[PDB]
Amino acid sequence: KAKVKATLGEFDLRDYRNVEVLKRFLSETGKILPRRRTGLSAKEQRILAKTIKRARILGLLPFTEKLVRK
Amino acid sequence: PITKEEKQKVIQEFARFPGDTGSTEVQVALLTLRINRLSEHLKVHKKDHHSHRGLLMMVGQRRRLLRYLQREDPERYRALIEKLGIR
Amino acid sequence: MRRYEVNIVLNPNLDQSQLALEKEIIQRALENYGARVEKVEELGLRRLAYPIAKDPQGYFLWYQVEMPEDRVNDLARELRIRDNVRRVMVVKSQEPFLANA
Amino acid sequence: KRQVASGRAYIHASYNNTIVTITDPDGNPITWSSGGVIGYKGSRKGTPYAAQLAALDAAKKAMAYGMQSVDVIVRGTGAGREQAIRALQASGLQVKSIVDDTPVPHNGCRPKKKFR
RNA sequence: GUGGGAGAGGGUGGUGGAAUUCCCGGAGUAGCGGUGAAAUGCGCAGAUACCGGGAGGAACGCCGAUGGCGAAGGCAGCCACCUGGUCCACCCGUGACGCUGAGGCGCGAAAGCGUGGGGAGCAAACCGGAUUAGAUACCCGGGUAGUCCACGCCCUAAACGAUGCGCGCUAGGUCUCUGGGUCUCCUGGGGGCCGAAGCUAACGCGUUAAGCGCGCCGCCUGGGGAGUACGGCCGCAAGGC
Ligand SMILES: [Mg+2]
Ligand SMILES: [Mg+2]
Ligand SMILES: [Mg+2]
Ligand SMILES: [Mg+2]
Ligand SMILES: [Mg+2]
Ligand SMILES: [Mg+2]
Ligand SMILES: [Mg+2]
Ligand SMILES: [Mg+2]
Ligand SMILES: [Mg+2]
Ligand SMILES: [Mg+2]
Ligand SMILES: [Mg+2]
Ligand SMILES: [Mg+2]
Ligand SMILES: [Mg+2]
Ligand SMILES: [Mg+2]
Ligand SMILES: [Mg+2]
Ligand SMILES: [Mg+2]
Ligand SMILES: [Mg+2]
Ligand SMILES: [Mg+2]
Ligand SMILES: [Mg+2]
Ligand SMILES: [Mg+2]
Ligand SMILES: [Mg+2]
Ligand SMILES: [Mg+2]
Ligand SMILES: [Mg+2]
Ligand SMILES: [Mg+2]
Ligand SMILES: [Mg+2]
Ligand SMILES: [Mg+2]
Ligand SMILES: [Mg+2]
Ligand SMILES: [Mg+2]
Ligand SMILES: [Mg+2]
Ligand SMILES: [Mg+2]
Ligand SMILES: [Mg+2]
Ligand SMILES: [Mg+2]
Ligand SMILES: [Mg+2]
Ligand SMILES: [Mg+2]
Ligand SMILES: [Mg+2]
Ligand SMILES: [Mg+2]
Ligand SMILES: [Mg+2]
Ligand SMILES: [Mg+2]
Ligand SMILES: [Mg+2]
Ligand SMILES: [Mg+2]
Fold first, then answer.
1. Is C99 exposed, middle or buried (CB count within 10 Å of its CB: 0-12, 13-18, 19+)?
2. What is d(CA C92, CA B45) in angstroms, rounded to the nearest whole number?
3. Do residues D4 and D22 make contact, with C-beta atoms less than 8 angstroms apart?
4. Is D11:D75 a contact under the CB 8 Å cutoff?
5. Hey, what CATH topology would domain B1-87 get?
6. Domains of chain C (ranges, CATH numbers)
7. Which helix (DSSP H) or strand (DSSP E) does residue B33 occupy?
8. B60 CA to middle of ligand 24, Å?
9. What GO terms fall under cellular component here (chain B)?
10. Which residues from chain C sit within 8 angstroms of residue A57, using beta carbons?
11. Which nucleotides in chain E lie closer than 7 A to a protein CB?
12. Which of residues 22-41 of B touch strand E (CB under 7 A)?
């Protein structure tokens, strides 16, 4: 399995209002994916984090979710 | 904060000649502007120490330059002091 | 003055007159604090990822503005007073850092 | 005297005891069980077997109300947590889904000395 | 100077979600909790588990790192305001304006003190339960000061890199954070690991020196007695130098 950035277009890392793109950086649980899966730069990663959290406060993205199967 | 035009006004005011940026006059001027700003900031926010250190360092630099000016050309030193109204 | 973005999330169930009243108060508030309105995006009804004020959904507005800095926080404080306004987030506008470009 | 026939089955597991609660679709409980409910009393309540028997008991008590469709919800980590689900699948009850909801903080509270 | 950059650097205000606890309500029986095993404890005035609602305090999961910032202490949700340090490029300005720094002044984790608040969770002291030859200990159940905020004191530490600050010089290899560049790479500035020369009692250090040099400050002179006595100064006290 490849990474998130690997399959994606040209997208703003600073857009907190864009759900369609951001969601893909989260797991089944609302947790933020590590760099191993996101494949970003540490800089990219930080900006992603901040942005995600912004989206969360706006209710656009989940703070957490529940794990299926198991 | 201090924006570009704010800075430039002072630079133009204190420059010995046109184009002059880094002369002792101008340095002490800008420095003293930052000083005043920081002091007004430390009127409130008395709990901010990390900035107060910066203030100390700035003050020190200013006193260094002034001591230099007074050493070389006492007249210009008197002029600066008179203008800025410090020390 | 600097460049900001005001995100407003209000109650989904407002009808025409109500919503228009709220947007009226918003506009008035913006003008009062001296915010020039450059552009605006109203996304309206969207499905929240978690319930906000017991509501599963929300009404979304976005305002790109230029306004005096010292008046920002107050301008936020004034907006949250409305019961019908659930969320207000003001953010300094920033350049679009890109990736995978 | 209800006849519910569909609902959620919560399994709360710990290293001390494992308990089970059957509930109606909007969350109100119907019947329940635990290691203490059955014969076991002391640490014996922590064994997976106890979890099994508990799941079973609650399952029967659910059959009494005519329960059929069951959505499993798991909380906590403990021996026999999985065993509980195992017995619950073989309970005769048909399990629609299983989810792990185990509460985790965002590090709000300081725990007891033995938890640090 | 101009133009760019990264950051849990600092201060003020606002705000968000998870969880614990408590209160309200629904529904729901016979235990829960806890341990090596147990008991104290809570439960028929209905607990635990489950749903919904509310109150309040404290701390910010994932991101998160072998990472970043700061002079040190230390700094992690998000937003805004106020503000310090710093790095790079351009080679534009002043023209030795430099380095260090006894005393002074300021900062200074935690615990602790004063006055006023606040109090969920944790928890010195303390009250109990079991263990055990015994318990004041290790395990378990409660629990006050305190932990939290404001303001004023306290000045300590394994305050640790057990390595004062600055500058010049002396092979590289590799991982990395952050700039610039004509972007297999090169060039700055940080963070690590191996290792030339060399140093070192050894371990080890090795362009982030413990190498070769220079300047300046602090400190050492066998162990115990002893960071004790006396004196002084600081302190509300504890006590500190
Ligand atoms: Mg038990
Ligand atoms: Mg910060
Ligand atoms: Mg801050
Ligand atoms: Mg109840
Ligand atoms: Mg009993
Ligand atoms: Mg009783
Ligand atoms: Mg009683
Ligand atoms: Mg509840
Ligand atoms: Mg209360
Ligand atoms: Mg971590
Ligand atoms: Mg570190
Ligand atoms: Mg430390
Ligand atoms: Mg800054
Ligand atoms: Mg030149
Ligand atoms: Mg010249
Ligand atoms: Mg010095
Ligand atoms: Mg202190
Ligand atoms: Mg303290
Ligand atoms: Mg006190
Ligand atoms: Mg205790
Ligand atoms: Mg005893
Ligand atoms: Mg005892
Ligand atoms: Mg306790
Ligand atoms: Mg030396
Ligand atoms: Mg290297
Ligand atoms: Mg580059
Ligand atoms: Mg580089
Ligand atoms: Mg030597
Ligand atoms: Mg040797
Ligand atoms: Mg080595
Ligand atoms: Mg050196
Ligand atoms: Mg040596
Ligand atoms: Mg002697
Ligand atoms: Mg001696
Ligand atoms: Mg002493
Ligand atoms: Mg004497
Ligand atoms: Mg004395
Ligand atoms: Mg006295
Ligand atoms: Mg002492
Ligand atoms: Mg001292």
1. middle
2. 23
3. no
4. yes
5. Helix Hairpins (1.10.287)
6. 1-101 (3.30.70.60)
7. helix B24-43
8. 27
9. cytosolic small ribosomal subunit
10. 87, 89
11. 1-3, 6-20, 26-39, 48-54, 57-65, 67, 70-73, 77-85, 92-98, 106-108, 120-124, 139-141, 150-152, 176-179
12. 22-24, 27, 30, 34, 37-38, 41
* Entry field: residues in chain B: 87
Resolution, expressed in angstroms to one decimal:
3.5
Topology (CATH) of A1-70: 30s Ribosomal Protein S18 (4.10.640)
Give the residue carrying structure tokens 């890109």. Answer: C98
- Domains, chain D, with CATH or none: 1-116 (3.30.420.80)
Give dist(CA B65, CA B24) in Å, integer. Answer: 7
**D61 CA → E34 C1’, Å:** 28
Are A70 and D100 inside 8 Å of each other by CB? Answer: yes
Each domain of chain A, given as residue ranges in start order, spans: 1-70
DSSP-assigned beta bridge partners for residue D79: none
